[PDB]
Amino acid sequence: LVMSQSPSSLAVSAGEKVTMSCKSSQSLFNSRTRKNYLAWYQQKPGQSPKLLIYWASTRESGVPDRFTGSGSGTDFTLTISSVQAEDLAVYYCKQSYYHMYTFGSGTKLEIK
Numbered sequence: 573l574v575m576s577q578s579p580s581s582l583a584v585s586a587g588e589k590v591t592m593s594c595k596s597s598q599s600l601f602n603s604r605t606r607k608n609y610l611a612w613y614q615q616k617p618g619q620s621p622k623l624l625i626y627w628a629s630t631r632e633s634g635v636p637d638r639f640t641g642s643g644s645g646t647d648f649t650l651t652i653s654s655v656q657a658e659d660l661a662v663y664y665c666k667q668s669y670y671h672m673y674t675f676g677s678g679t680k681l682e683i684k
């Protein structure tokens with residue numbers, strides 16, 4: 573199961589908005605639980621990953637609503653409104669539909 577992300581890199585100014593995509597090779601929706609098993613992680617310079625959103629659109633505790641996840645099946649999106657300098661990082665989507673979870677290659681976000 574391959575996880576494809578785009579674009580590879582983004583360079584924007586503070587206050588702008590960005591949208592990144594994550595496409596799964598197989599549908600990640602489960603009709604029994606009615607949940608898309610797709611998560612988004614934020615990885616800051618030299619640190620371990622931080623879970624941001626799970627079940628495609630549900631935010632973790634303390635995560636600002638500037639971060640918005642959406643999509644279902646095979647095509648997902650993570651949107652960041654009014655980007656801030658602190659958001660500088662690499663964002664990864666991760667599927668937990670199968671035993672062995674899989675990560676996408678990520679989208680690097682840099683602030684000008």
Ligand SMILES: [Co+2]
Binds near residue numbers: 609668
């Ligand atoms: Co999930």
